[PDB]
Amino acid sequence: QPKRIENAKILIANTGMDTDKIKIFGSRVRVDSTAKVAEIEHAEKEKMKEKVERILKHGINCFINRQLIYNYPEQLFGAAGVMAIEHADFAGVERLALVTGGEIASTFDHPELVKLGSCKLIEEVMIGEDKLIHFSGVALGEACTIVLRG
Amino acid sequence: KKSVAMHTNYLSACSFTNSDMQILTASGDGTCALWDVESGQLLQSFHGHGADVLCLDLAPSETGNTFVSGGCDKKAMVWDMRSGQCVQAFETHESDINSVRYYAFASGRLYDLRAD
Amino acid sequence: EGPLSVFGDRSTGETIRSQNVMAAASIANIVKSSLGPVGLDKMLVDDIGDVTITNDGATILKLLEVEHPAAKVLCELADLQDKEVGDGTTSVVIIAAELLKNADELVKQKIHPTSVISGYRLACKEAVRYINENLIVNTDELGRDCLINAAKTSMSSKIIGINGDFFANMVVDAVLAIKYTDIRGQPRYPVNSVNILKAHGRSQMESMLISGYALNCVVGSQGMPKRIVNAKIACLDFSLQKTKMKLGVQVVITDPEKLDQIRQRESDITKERIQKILATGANVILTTGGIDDMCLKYFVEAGAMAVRRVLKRDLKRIAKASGATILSTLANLEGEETFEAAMLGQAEEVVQERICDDELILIKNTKARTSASIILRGANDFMCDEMERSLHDALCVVKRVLESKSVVPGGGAVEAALSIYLENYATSMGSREQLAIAEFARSLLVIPNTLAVNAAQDSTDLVAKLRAFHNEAQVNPERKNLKWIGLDLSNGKPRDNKQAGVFEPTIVKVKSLKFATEAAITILRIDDLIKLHPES
Amino acid sequence: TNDGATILKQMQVLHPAARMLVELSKAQDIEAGDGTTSVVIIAGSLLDSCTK
Amino acid sequence: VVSQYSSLLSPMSVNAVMKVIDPATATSVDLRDIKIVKKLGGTIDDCELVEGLVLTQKVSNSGITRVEKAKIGLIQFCLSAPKTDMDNQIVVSDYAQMDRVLREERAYILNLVKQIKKTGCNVLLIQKSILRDALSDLALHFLNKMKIMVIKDIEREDIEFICKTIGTKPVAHIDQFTADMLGSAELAEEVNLNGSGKLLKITGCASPGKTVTIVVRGSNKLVIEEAERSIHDALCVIRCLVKKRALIAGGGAPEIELAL
Amino acid sequence: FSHPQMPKKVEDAKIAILTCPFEPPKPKTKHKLDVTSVEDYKALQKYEKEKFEEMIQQIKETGANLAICQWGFDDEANHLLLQNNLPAVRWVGGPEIELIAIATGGRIVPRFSELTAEKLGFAGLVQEISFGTTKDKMLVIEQCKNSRAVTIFI
Ligand SMILES: Nc1ncnc2c1ncn2[C@@H]1O[C@H](COP(=O)(O)OP(=O)(O)O)[C@@H](O)[C@H]1O
Ligand SMILES: Nc1ncnc2c1ncn2[C@@H]1O[C@H](COP(=O)(O)OP(=O)(O)O)[C@@H](O)[C@H]1O
Ligand SMILES: [Mg+2]
Ligand SMILES: [Mg+2]
């Protein structure tokens, strides 16, 4: 994924994006041949690809998910040229929603009913010996980050 | 084997989740921790419950989203993955609950979730 | 304890410096009695009666329990020389301890350790340069005899020493057999591909050099033949057992009539695989996995040898030597399950030989590649175990000589020559480094002194004569033939060691100096020790 | 070791002032990476003067 | 302790810092882009600066240890029997279904290997996989038969470093595995260190993007540790010089001037 | 309120009390659902999505302004509730569910299919209360019609 986005279109999410399984926990795959198993695996990968396509249909440059993002959605976002930030905890997604104005979404069947956060520039900065993601020119800014050096 | 060994303190109980994808662990500081077997990242650490946890029980009907933890706080308190919050707690126990069995769940006093 | 408030002990100054030298000297004194042809082996008891009679320096320090960190440095230094050179393990420990012992004496005279370290580094760099410019003998001028002489020199002080006339030929022949050339045309000798089997019994003279490979395995079943003339060796990396479905496959029976046929396939699948292998004419089947009883019967009826539980490294050497190909599975690129004759290795004979109430497989005279193996015979396992360690050193020595075609005179010739040159070169380098470089020259004399002491001879007199001969060599341009003069421990007089056939690989002396200097520098760099008390 | 940060980290100092000095070494290593011994020596000299 | 080796380490440290930053624009240096590899044996004089990528993993292939004009490709999926994320079992009710399952699994593995090979790839890096066999022995046999170097058990934390070094885009599904995902390199070779270990070096890349590796060697553990620490100190000093373009005399001059 | 972005105050709230978690239905008996083809997988996925959408639409159809559950729910249901202007609270205890049902004059509905307009409770004001610099929040239900339950807050 790109490391620098200008005029970002933030989409804050709280979805799975990690071996996303159907919540029917009594379901199982029971076939008589490994060809059918391979077909079901391809169907699962196609489901994940369709999920990523639905996310991308919002017309976004950045994507923050509260939970983890596995390798396949990661490469899908990279090929789409979309910067995807994973494992931003509840406080993190709440703060991004407060500072950028985005809506924490969990379904993407209605792109027009979900508002997107916006900021002038996102880049990576060095603070001491650690690298952090910087949101610059935020829209609302009702959330602050205070850096303490001691 | 996972053999992750990312832990500052000892592990009272390392309960593998019913879903064959992640593990649930509780350190000696009374904070439970959830780890992903595949990626290795710590999904979320559960605060509260200052004394060390002593037993971990996942939901029996799969549903890898809620679990109950008890330790030296004489507490029986239930969590939720989807919010990371203590959704339910109990006060009847008064002495260092050793083992907990999930039915409602029986710990050593049978609790009922539908009526607290 | 005081204002520091650290839960542990502390030592500073000459107190810790002496301890490091004392600890380093303790390790050397352990192995000083096992240097040179007049050296003696050592006996190690492992607290449960396990006896290890050995003369190798690395083996002695491997089994010893060392606590001092400075001692551990020298013990690990011996292992590094063993792994990266294979010989001179006792010399490097003795030299490093002597280097550190003499360096501390300079430090006690208010010479800063940085000056001592600087002097040691310059001396080590110049010692290597002097060796490569004045003390190397090209092996191309000597033919095959240098390899035998180099092998015989390494065999001295070992339990196969006096019998070195017969043992040197076996080692040289073994190394020359496994020789192969690679890309860029560099002839490389993969020593340790010569399998060494130990079996007590007849005298050491009866040790055999197999013109092939020796397997420490037996045939699977007694009904099979124990000798094949024109062997067609097939190497497999999978077990020949009853077929069992994997974890993700279950057998659920609804119609009861389908049960018998399904159970039939559990054993018929393996039979079809075995028949395919046998149909191509294979006589010997070697597999890393197990073979069930019902699978062995197919080889029994076909009159074919089948060996199971073959070690993976053994199978690789057999396949490479015989021209076979390891097949972890029977599957072509067309999705079928086939076996072709192209994956069959060939040998001139395979025999289930008997060696002292035991039995082993000899794959004799493999084609498309020449291999070698050695079977060592001795009084007992203690004797046989030490023969293997001594033989490994001789194999390593021959490998270095064949790769790097330069050798140096043995018997302290190099150390005596270096001591004279370094002490003269010291006067033309620095002002404080002069003492450090000179002390480096003196420390190298610990090798010829230790050789003479082990022979209970006049070490002071012999080294003085040995140094006098080398002194004339470096000052008289017409007496340069005296560089080869070393020590003759049998008669206790100096002797031309190049004429005597006492040779060592140049890499053994060069790596000994570089490794010992760095190890000595590391300990010399310490001036304070903090030992935290155990947390328990 | 000759590195000041490593020297101070490895030894288990118990007095709180020594712990603060160790943390100071860590901070100097983080910001600069060199001068880790010098900063501790400077702090010690400063407090020694503070005594008088 | 490495003072006599300064004539070798100082240019090495300067080159390592310069190779990972843009001198005309950079305001800070990320030392995580300079990997330090410690291998026992040899002498500190043997310390090397590798332009490409050095991996400590072992090649699973036997006999294929050198590849020229390599086309490396990262794999984040598993080359084994199909296994969906759901709970999956194969139910057998007839004898024919047994060898049908065997044949279909073989065909699936062969199809995966053929798809990998058709892109022209010849060196394959497999990410470490848990809960599923990353590299089945049958898949390894097919890969060996097509003359493809295979390296597995790649740590999940080294993917970014590998991608930055050799310019390879990781692939998580076989559908997206194409030629453009490969990172072309001049040479991929595994070399032994005087019988004291083995190292895989991929030296020479069409896209050597701001990443360098330093191989530290020494006689014993402690001297290697201090070689690493001293090299890190030198890198940190050059990093400071990058952050703050100012130089001051040493040897106690600033302290005496300050006191006066 | 479960979602951090739902409004903190609801006035004239039509309260819907539920004891069914906003999750796809799950039989109590040991049940195994077999997926034997790609079409089965697609049908199951569509069934999940339609179950979520249908339960949310059923809650919305009664005209309720606020929904209270007892067993919590997952991300999709939470975002659908936020998207449809339906403030909701989850994991409310059993005794608290009973008290809310008594005070608001509404019944307890065990599943969405039985949720009607006449079973909705009424409250004049539902609010979220902060307690200073403590991050802790509490829900307040009051201004009922003829509330038969009271709460003493000390
Ligand atoms: N026949 C010989 N005559 C004189 N000196 C010898 C003879 N053979 C070996 N030496 C010397 O004895 C020294 C001790 O070698 P040794 O201790 O056996 O090797 P290692 O140190 O590997 O055990 C060698 O440096 C060698 O120069
Ligand atoms: N060749 C030299 N001559 C004089 N002073 C030196 C020399 N090299 C280093 N120094 C001084 O030694 C001091 C200590 O440096 P060093 O031990 O390398 O790191 P640290 O500052 O962390 O202790 C530095 O302040 C430097 O001015
Ligand atoms: Mg020797
Ligand atoms: Mg410094």
Side-chain angles (χ1 to χ4, degrees), chain C residues 35-37 87-91 153 156-158 410-411 487 495 502 504:
Chain C
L35 189 74
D87 201 27
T89 310
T90 312
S91 294
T153 304
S156 300
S157 68
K158 298 302 190 297
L487 278 187
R495 169 194 60 187
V502 184
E504 312 171 5

Side-chain angles (χ1 to χ4, degrees), chain B residues 25-37:
Chain B
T25 53
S27 173
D29 56 357
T31 63
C32 303
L34 187 72
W35 301 88
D36 199 23
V37 177

Side-chain angles (χ1 to χ4, degrees), chain E residues 74-202:
Chain E
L74 282 172
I75 288 312
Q76 282 185 303
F77 54 92
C78 312
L79 303 167
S80 63
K83 187 170 77 54
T84 67
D85 297 315
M86 293 177 70
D87 295 327
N88 58 282
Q89 308 102 25
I90 312 152
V91 171
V92 178
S93 300
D94 286 329
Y95 73 101
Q97 292 193 350
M98 282 178 130
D99 74 352
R100 211 194 312 288
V101 173
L102 264 72
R103 175 191 324 282
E104 286 185 349
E105 168 183 326
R106 277 203 314 268
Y108 172 74
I109 300 295
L110 180 64
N111 174 74
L112 288 176
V113 177
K114 278 197 175 170
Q115 288 279 318
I116 291 182
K117 176 61 152 46
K118 192 174 60 180
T119 66
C121 165
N122 52 7
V123 177
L124 198 78
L125 312 185
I126 302 182
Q127 195 192 17
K128 160 178 281 174
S129 184
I130 311 167
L131 280 154
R132 194 181 167 176
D133 199 349
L135 182 67
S136 172
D137 63 358
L138 191 152
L140 176 56
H141 158 78
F142 291 168
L143 280 161
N144 196 355
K145 197 168 172 61
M146 293 180 183
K147 309 309 169 194
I148 287 187
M149 185 180 288
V150 172
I151 299 103
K152 76 151 179 191
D153 269 6
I154 288 287
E155 293 293 328
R156 290 190 162 264
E157 294 79 2
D158 304 336
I159 299 295
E160 179 76 276
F161 190 87
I162 291 158
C163 299
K164 265 182 65 66
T165 319
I166 66 185
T168 302
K169 321 199 202 328
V171 192
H173 200 231
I174 191 72
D175 294 353
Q176 282 71 61
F177 189 86
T178 46
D180 55 346
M181 295 298 102
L182 306 184
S184 197
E186 198 45 57
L187 169 70
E189 184 185 11
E190 180 181 11
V191 288
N192 54 3
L193 304 167
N194 286 34
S196 61
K198 272 180 166 166
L199 278 190
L200 186 139
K201 294 170 50 207
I202 311 172

Side-chain angles (χ1 to χ4, degrees), chain D residues 33-36, chain E residues 233 237:
Chain D
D34 200 6
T36 312
Chain E
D233 265 12
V237 165

Side-chain angles (χ1 to χ4, degrees), chain C residues 404-419:
Chain C
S404 72
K405 289 182 180 179
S406 60
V407 290
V408 297
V414 159
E415 284 85 2
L418 277 184
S419 70

